[PDB]
Amino acid sequence: MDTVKNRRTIRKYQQKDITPDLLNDLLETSFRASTMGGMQLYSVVVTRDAEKKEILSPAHFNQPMVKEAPVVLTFCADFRRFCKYCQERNAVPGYGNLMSFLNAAMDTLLVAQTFCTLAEEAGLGICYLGTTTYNPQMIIDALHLPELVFPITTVTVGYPAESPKQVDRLPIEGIIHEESYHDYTAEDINRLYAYKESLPENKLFIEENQKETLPQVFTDVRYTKKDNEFMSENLLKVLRRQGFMD
Ligand X SMILES: Cc1cc2nc3c(=O)[nH]c(=O)nc-3n(C[C@H](O)[C@H](O)[C@H](O)COP(=O)(O)O)c2cc1C
Detail the residues annotated as belonging to a binding site: 7, 9, 11, 35, 63, 130, 169
- CA-wise closest residue to 148 among 193, 98, 191: 98
Q: With binding defined as CB under 6 A, does residue 69 bind ligand X? A: no
Query: What is the SS3 assignment for 243?
Result: coil
List the binding residues for FMN. 7, 9, 11, 35, 63, 130, 169
Name the one range near ligand X by CB under 6 A: 5-13, 136-144, 201-209, 237-245: 5-13
Question: From the centroid of its chain, how far is CA 194?
Answer: 28
From ligand X, a copy of itself, none, which one binds at residue 131 (CB under 5 to 8 Å depending on kind)? ligand X
145-174 residues near ligand X, rule: CB under 6 A = 153, 167
With 0-12 / 13-18 / 19 or more C-beta atoms within 10 angstroms meaning exposed / middle / buried, residue 92 is: exposed
Distance CA 189, CA 28 (A): 42
Among the listed residues 50, 175, 200, 208, the single contact to a copy of itself using CB under 8 A: 175
131, 64 in Cβ contact below 8 A? no
| φ, ψ (nearest 5 deg) of residue 18 | -100, 115
77, 245 in Cβ contact below 8 A? no
Q: With binding defined as CB under 8 A, does residue 240 bind a copy of itself? A: no
Question: From the centroid of its chain, how far is CA 147?
Answer: 21
Q: With binding defined as CB under 8 A, does residue 109 bind a copy of itself? A: yes
Q: With binding defined as CB under 6 A, does residue 36 bind ligand X? A: yes
Among the listed residues 24, 34, 224, 232, the single contact to ligand X using CB under 6 A: 34
Tell the smallest beta-carbon distance from residue 15 to a copy of itself (Å). Answer: 21
> Which residues make up the interface to ligand X (CB under 6 A)?
8-9, 11, 34-38, 63, 106-107, 110, 127-131, 153, 167
